[PDB]
């Protein structure tokens, strides 16, 4: 999270952390609950091509990552079959985990959006995670979880902006109908933050609008975050996820 | 350049090297003459996004990278207005010299296919650089051009490959209609390759198949080197050189 | 830390580690309360060459480093003179800090040896810190202070191994007489545990034989870990602390 | 070499390159070619542990390193006895090679100063190698061989200079009399120039002054490039090199 700062404790219930086996359980990328037994995640984080099961596994919120850790097992990994690259889009993917976590006020699932719902321009998001404060600037120790406040962007801007500066014909998409954008040069995701949610409150209530997925770096000029729209997708996602 | 060796003098009169300004003016990419004032490369050696013209320059056919070099500056960068990602397509750019450079034995053009040329399994085909020679290992001075002869694989054949052990859908295709492939786990391209050519000889002619673009590393398990297939943009490059 | 475990919360109370300002206050040293206003460290965490004393902070006992530091500004440094390398010796150093600490059983002072103690081979002696756990291997999140039992060896012991498989004469000494070896290739000291203590416990007490200083590399056949001896420096560190 | 420049191919005949076995032969240290079997170079470039010999060559001057290697084997090495850390100093070693090299214009041995020669402060002396360019920086490729004009300093003002900025005692001893001092921070050896030679010319003929050996860092303030001082080691030199 770059422009933001430690998130307080009583929020974010559903953000959690991917580890990887090493030395030690890494943090790679976040992610989200979405239901006692589903993570909710970038498909670029676990594929395209096919990981280790056994190598993998998930923290539930956290306030600093590694001091209290408690490390569950996934038992199903499953990437958006159309899935290739994020520049391509279909980046999501989803962890089922190996029981459905009791959930409390601390830790708890996120609502999906309707299918409807459209997020206007303007509207103050908020993306959390533990990923780089900067362009190859690490979250120092002790990685408390951050949080930021980002403008949802019309994806016909975020297009034109991505354009600007590049060699890209202007009638040829980059920012594709999947995705969705939102930050500037002072607010957003970045490195490690990819998986993790992107969150808008309508009608007091929050809705996941995104999953954090590229970008050309984070906070540079006339390039947005682009995240993966989590209502192009509701369709997929409710194959496997009971509503 | 993995597997292969160096290349003897007198071959690939049109390998030239792609330079970045810094502490030195490093080699970061390949590229091939194709016109005394014109150079064929990859699109993602000067893009996406638009660079400083000045901090660019071309080296053209040297056996030893930065041993005898005689840099020379560039007037354009066109670059293939369909081009965002390797992983898309249309990875290919055209560099204009700011004068027509002398041609000889030594540096002179390559010929560009006809359209209608394929290039089929089977068909003797080279990819030449100053690139690493494995995964994640440079090219150890003095920096020797190489070689290697690589094998092309049919595009439905190579598409089938990158769908091996990978989550995304069989009918999804990652290897496009406008790429191709070829190299095995012995003999491939690999990083500084990039821009560089492909060329096969067809009928005593060398001619330049392809583009050295992109690939999952260097002579890995089902992963052929990708090349953008140069007869695609036949079109748009002579929209450009003459 | 080599070999070795995570240490229980009830023991070292006297353990500290020291913070270089950066993008975060990074540990880089151990050290030892011995006062409540003095830490005992190796000069060569400080020196020779004269800091700037805002850049430098410390912190008290803590299990997981970072996790809850609170960081006490420092008053003075004051390295040894007859330092300049650790292989030459007088590696040690003290920290007068701002404040006087408040003393309790989980935050509080290690005892100096007598100056007749020598620490033979076969006493029991640890060393603590949280330095990394091999040659070039970081001691990973969430950091832990670490404990290992090390051996000591006799001075002369561990001289005539520090010249197995060197050029160096036999004669000529390595190993110096203000100096201690502790350690085998399976328990050991290592980078970033610098400064920190080797505590004997001696009819009961425990004591600070030495402070870590240096070794070639970590856990390495023939190469124990060796520490400044603190016996040696007594008359030192008491014309400064009480 | 910091602040000089590219050396004329016609200079220098008795620059020595040092190469280890690895992916290519590369250059860890110069030396100076003192007899036409025997290479003058400091011990810490090949000791105090004992090194394998089939994994270390020669090369005589080359104008740019790699271009146009023909790589010497070695017969023996002698690190100096007393040595164990440039800072503590004996930092010297011979390299016998297993062949007496023919000498030419292009390619010829230095000669070695008498005992008692004195080289005074403020003489105009040379230092060459192919290392670093300043702190950290690389010398670039094509590797030319590099050239800098160092004034000789005196032993006392050299070692006062090292006391300034630090916390030893003015009265202990850094830099010790089989030392030598010499640049300032416009112009220093730096590392990977270690082992080669400060020759300094005396009545019109080259002596060797020095072997590049130690410093804190290079050409910065108040540390000069400290050498090992040829004069204080003839004896032992001359224990294994005919006059
Ligand atoms: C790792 Si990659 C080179 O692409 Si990028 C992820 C650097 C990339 C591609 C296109 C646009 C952007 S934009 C961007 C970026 O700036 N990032 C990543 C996203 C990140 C981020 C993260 C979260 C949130 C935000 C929003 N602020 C931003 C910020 C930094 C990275 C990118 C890559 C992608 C997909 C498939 C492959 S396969 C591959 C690969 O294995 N190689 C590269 C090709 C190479 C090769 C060269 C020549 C010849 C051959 C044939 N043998 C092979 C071998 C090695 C690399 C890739
Ligand atoms: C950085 Si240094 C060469 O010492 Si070392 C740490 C590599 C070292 C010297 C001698 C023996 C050992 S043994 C060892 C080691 O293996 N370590 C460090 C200790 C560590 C450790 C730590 C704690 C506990 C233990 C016990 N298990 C072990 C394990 C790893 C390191 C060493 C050094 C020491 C003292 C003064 C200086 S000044 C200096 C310096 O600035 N440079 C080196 C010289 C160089 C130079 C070259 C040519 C010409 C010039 C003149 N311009 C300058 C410029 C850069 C470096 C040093
Ligand atoms: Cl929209
Ligand atoms: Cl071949
Ligand atoms: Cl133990
Ligand atoms: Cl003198």
């Given at each position: 999270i770059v422009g933001g700062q430690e998130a307080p404790r009583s929020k974010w219930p559903w953000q959690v952390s991917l580890r990887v086996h090493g030395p030690y359980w890494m943090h790679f990328c976040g992610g989200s609950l979405i239901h006692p037994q589903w993570v909710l995640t970038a498909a670029h984080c676990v594929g395209?091509?096919?990981?280790?099961?056994?190598?993998?596994?998930?923290?539930?919120?956290?306030?600093?990552?590694?001091?209290?850790?408690?490390?569950?097992?996934?038992?199903?990994?499953?990437?958006?079959?159309?899935?290739?690259?994020?520049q391509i889009g279909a980046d999501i993917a989803l962890?089922?985990?190996?029981?459905?976590?009791?959930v409390s006020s601390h830790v708890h699932t996120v609502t999906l959006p309707p299918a409807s719902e459209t997020f206007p321009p303007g509207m103050p998001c908020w993306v959390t995670g533990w990923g780089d404060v900067d362009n190859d600037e690490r979250l120092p120790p002790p990685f408390p979880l951050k949080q930021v406040k980002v403008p949802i962007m019309e994806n016909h801007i975020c297009d034109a902006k991505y354009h600007l500066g590049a060699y890209?014909?202007?009638?040829?998409?980059?920012?594709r109908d999947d995705m969705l954008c939102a930050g500037n040069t002072?607010?957003?995701?970045?490195?490690?933050?990819?998986?993790?949610?992107?969150?808008?409150?309508?009608?007091?209530?929050?809705?996941?609008?995104?999953?954090?997925?590229?970008?050309?770096?984070?906070?540079?000029?006339?390039?947005?975050?682009?995240?993966?729209?989590?209502?192009?997708?509701?369709?997929?996602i409710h194959h496997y996820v009971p509503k």
């Open positions: 395209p091509d096919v990981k280790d099961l056994a190598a993998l596994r998930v923290q539930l919120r956290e306030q600093h990552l590694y001091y209290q850790d408690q490390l569950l097992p996934v038992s199903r990994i499953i990437v958006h079959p159309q899935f290739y690259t994020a962890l089922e985990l190996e029981e459905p976590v009791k890209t014909g202007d009638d040829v998409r980059i920012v002072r607010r957003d995701s970045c490195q490690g933050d990819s998986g993790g949610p992107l969150v808008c409150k309508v009608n007091g209530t929050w809705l996941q609008a995104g999953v954090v997925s590229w970008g050309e770096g984070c906070a540079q000029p006339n390039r947005p975050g682009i995240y993966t729209r989590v209502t192009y997708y509701l369709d997929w």
